[PDB]
Amino acid sequence: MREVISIHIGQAGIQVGNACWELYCLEHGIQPDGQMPDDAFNTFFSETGAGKHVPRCIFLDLEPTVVDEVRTGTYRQLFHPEQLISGKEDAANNFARGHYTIGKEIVDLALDRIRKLADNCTGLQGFLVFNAVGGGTGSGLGSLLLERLSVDYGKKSKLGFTVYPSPQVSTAVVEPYNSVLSTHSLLEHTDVAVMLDNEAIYDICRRSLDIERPTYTNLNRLIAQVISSLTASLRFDGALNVDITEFQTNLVPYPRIHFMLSSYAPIISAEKAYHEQLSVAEITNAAFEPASMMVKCDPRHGKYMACCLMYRGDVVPKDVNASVATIKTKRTIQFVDWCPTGFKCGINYQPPTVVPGGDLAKVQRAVCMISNSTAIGEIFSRLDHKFDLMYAKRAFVHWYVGEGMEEGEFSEAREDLAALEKDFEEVG
Amino acid sequence: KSAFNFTQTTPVFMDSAPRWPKENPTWPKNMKATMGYKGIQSNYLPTNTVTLKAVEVPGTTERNFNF
């Protein structure tokens, strides 16, 4: 009854699907072979006629070279073999191919799954879109898929966890372009869009985790710790159980501004816990610390329109309202005037679970903050520079125009960004 | 103004003995009641006690309510 649909698009889409679904199988005692030795799992699974607990998700991609790893990995008895969708040829880091040529010939298949994935669903909270902006499959298929989801349901909520291109780290050259094209299609179609950059999560692994050989498998073990904290209320008892609609009402002031930041705390090695107490007071000071952001944005250059705090573990509300109160007084944190409030707080009694072989530590208090700030214009203006720096020469255009696209789709998707950055200044 | 015997003209012949709902040295004046205010107002719960401050910086609002 309190159920969501978890979509994974692209490579990083399924790269985090392997971290998230290694968590819920472990957080509920679900063995890799489906069965375990209600509503604690009904948010993510579906008990069949006998014993088996299949998940409710969909792995979508164009290169089999990764979706087949799931078919050969230890989680092969888990998924319905039709959920693991894959293609023959790939998008080749080209937004057009993922949108016009190849996208149009598998969405008709993916959509049938969702229809057969929503009939058993009795009360659907909202879709859950794990996306990686910057590639043809991530940006093209994701864009084409979201529009199809809007015209089918519309009233259902889409949450966009989209990895965003970082300032320094860039595993591609044309990733500015398809990152721009994604906006015009995600903005009107996602209900709320969280952002996070592969660079910001790298430094988190430097100061806090003190892990010097970080890898994509490390970072994904952090994102799964967010969604686990985000949907704890959906499946675990706790004071101030916070659903999705509640979470969404008091965070998005205007239909445009739904690009928000994230954080997590405490993030520590399993040994520095021996040098700290990690009180509710201490953690919430670190959630608002700029170095604990999962995106390379600086909230001290902007203002806060709202925040949402999902605590976990041995936490009582008498200490939440106290630590929040000593933050509105802090000078560094500037709240835009038209919200004297700004905090929706959530508590759970189920502490964060730890995976064997992970880097975090077993703790009894943990915080995940998700703030809607007007400093988010920074990371959004860098793109407006690299796009205008390369597009001045029409570099790499002959690939996009050769795949059933045109020259208008560049200038069009460019104004939408300017149309957006004003909205992050009208709120001054 | 006859049949009234006004106070301004009542020779000490006429005189009254005060009765209970009135203070007098003979009967005890039992305890009374007053309102005691909320406490020192703040942005967290109001308290009676004054505490130290880490960030002094004249004319600024910084506290540590959580201790």
Ligand SMILES: Nc1nc2c(ncn2[C@@H]2O[C@H](COP(=O)(O)OP(=O)(O)OP(=O)(O)O)[C@@H](O)[C@H]2O)c(=O)[nH]1
């Ligand atoms: N946090 C995280 N980011 C990843 C991971 N893998 C890739 N990325 C980033 O995703 C971006 C590219 O997205 P991809 O999914 O690999 O490409 P695509 O969307 O499938 O499109 P095609 O390459 O044409 O198939 C790069 O910037 C990567 O840094 C991962 O495992 N974890």
Ligand SMILES: [Mg+2]
């Ligand atoms: Mg790819």
